[PDB]
């Protein structure tokens, strides 16, 4: 099994534009959205068909109540931050929690918060402590670390509960999450050599250019982009040397398979 991850995001906005929600929660398994909640619908709903098909309505009813509570909690926490920052206008508060089940069987777990899109508090579940980036976060860190039981609870959720949920969701969406669609890879000229791949899943791919069997600071890497049909595409370019002849080859690694395209 490849490496898989489960993460939940929260976004809180203090003075949102008339239509925009003030609170949004979205869960992900790898790059796939699985659940969503916002202050407008006030309902937790599936965002993947294999989630809706495998979780009974009582599951969505229960987490709808929980998220309504977490929504209020987020608003209170954001009100506290912006008052202590002495900030006016609209500001954002974000939370991200989740875990990874690595290929070798090991696990990672993480939990952190952001204010205006910048790191604010980062949890260390081994030392059972919070890393604060400024004195507003330092005040929050002191209050959170005074509740030792909450630190222990989050360590257990990250290391045990989160991994248990991930394995459960992985089986639900096995046909989607554990499949392999190999990339279609080509090369053309535009003066630089462009190596292009498309139609592949999972999105994790490694493309690079090699010059005479040596990999070179001289490569421009494109972003892995969603194609819209569940597959992804990527590219990588390198500039040609007109003063000397060199063997250029594109190297693509994807899902345990290596590919080499020699440029004639």
């Amino acid at each position, epitope marked *: 099994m490849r490496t898989h991850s489960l993460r939940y995001f929260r976004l809180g906005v203090s003075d949102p534009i008339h239509g925009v929600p003030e609170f949004i929660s979205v869960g992900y398994v790898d790059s796939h959205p699985i659940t969503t909640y916002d202050s407008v619908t*006030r309902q937790k709903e599936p965002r993947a068909p294999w989630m809706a098909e495998n979780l009974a309505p009582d599951h969505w009813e229960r987490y709808t109540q929980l998220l*309504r509570g977490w929504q209020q909690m987020f608003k209170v926490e954001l009100k506290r931050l912006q008052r202590h920052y002495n900030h006016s206008g609209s500001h954002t508060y974000q939370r991200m929690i989740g875990c990874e089940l690595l290929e070798d069987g090991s696990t990672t777990g993480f939990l952190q918060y952001a204010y205006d899109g910048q790191d604010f508090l980062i949890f260390n579940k081994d030392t059972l402590s919070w890393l604060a980036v400024d004195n507003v976060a330092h005040t929050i860190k002191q209050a959170w670390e005074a509740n030792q039981h909450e630190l222990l609870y*989050q360590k257990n959720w990250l290391e045990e509960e989160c991994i248990a949920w991930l394995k459960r969701f992985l089986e639900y969406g096995k046909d989607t999450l554990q499949r392999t669609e190999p990339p279609l890879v080509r090369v053309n000229r535009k003066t630089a050599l462009f190596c292009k791949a498309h139609g592949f899943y999972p999105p994790e791919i490694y493309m690079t250019w090699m010059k005479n069997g040596e990999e070179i600071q001289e490569i421009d890497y494109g972003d892995i982009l969603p194609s819209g049909d569940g597959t992804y595409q990527a590219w990588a370019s390198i500039e040609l040397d007109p003063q000397s002849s060199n063997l250029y080859s594109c190297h693509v690694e994807h899902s345990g398979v290596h590919m080499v395209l020699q440029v004639p």
Partner: antibody, heavy 109, light 116 residues
Framework: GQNIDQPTEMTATEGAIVQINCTYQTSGFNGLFWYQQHAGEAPTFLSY??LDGLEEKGRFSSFLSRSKGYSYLLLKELQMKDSASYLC??????????WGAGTKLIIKP | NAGVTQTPKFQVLKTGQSMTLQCAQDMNHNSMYWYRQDPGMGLRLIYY???????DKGEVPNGYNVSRLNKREFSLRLESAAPSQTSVYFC??????????????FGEGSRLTVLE
């Protein structure tokens, strides 16, 4: 399904030591609580465990083994005021409390 | 600083009679609960209120209704009392719901006996 079990009643002598057991079979685990309830009164929070080990708190200690699904509440130097029902409760994966039926602790003076 | 205050302490009812239990908390808590306690079994949740402005059913909601009037108050309504609703009712509150280590704070309890 989700189950939690503790003895119905226990009797010990004043000044001695008593260990009240609680075993649980739940879907997920987010912590185990112990509550004290004197006859005709409200339950009051005693302790919380979520990781393995022993946690002391006065004359009372609470132990947890996640792998065995088992916890005990340890009362040392028993006094008559310790006569009460002791309720064990577990938070499941969806943060819902499952309550044991309670153990009535009788103390012989 | 009274904690959780529920009323009444005792009540006898005839089958089919309406009844409302009151509960208030002055601890600025967000979550409130209504339990019933019966001999030989653990506390069973009737209804709960994760936060102000929302409520949902517990394990035994049939025969009951609740109203989260405001942040402090959470009333339990028995519309047509039945003999099986003879029990001791406990209202509780917690700072939040879904926080793992947060304990419950209980009210004194209300003893109801429903008779034919």
């Amino acid at each position: 399904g989700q189950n939690i079990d503790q003895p119905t009643e226990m009797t010990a002598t004043e000044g001695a030591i008593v260990q009240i057991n609680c075993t649980y079979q739940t879907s997920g685990f987010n912590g185990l609580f112990w509550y004290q309830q004197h006859a005709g009164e409200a339950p009051t929070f005693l302790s919380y465990n979520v990781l393995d080990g022993l946690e002391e708190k006065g004359r009372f200690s609470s132990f947890l083994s996640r792998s065995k699904g088992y916890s005990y509440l340890l009362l040392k130097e028993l006094q008559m005021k310790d006569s009460a029902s002791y309720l064990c409760a577990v938070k499941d994966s969806n943060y819902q409390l499952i309550w044991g039926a309670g153990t009535k602790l009788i103390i012989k003076p | 600083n009274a904690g959780v205050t529920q009323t009444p302490k005792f009540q006898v009812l005839k089958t089919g009679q309406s009844m409302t239990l009151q509960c208030a908390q002055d601890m600025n808590h967000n979550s409130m609960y209504w339990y019933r306690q019966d001999p030989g079994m653990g506390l069973r949740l009737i209804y709960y209120s994760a936060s102000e402005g929302t409520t949902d059913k517990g394990e035994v909601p049939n025969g009951y209704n609740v109203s989260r009037l405001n942040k402090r108050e959470f009333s339990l309504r028995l519309e047509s009392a039945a003999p099986s609703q003879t029990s001791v009712y406990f209202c509780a509150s917690s700072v939040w719901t879904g926080e793992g280590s947060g304990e419950l704070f209980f009210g004194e309890g209300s003893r109801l006996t429903v008779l034919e």
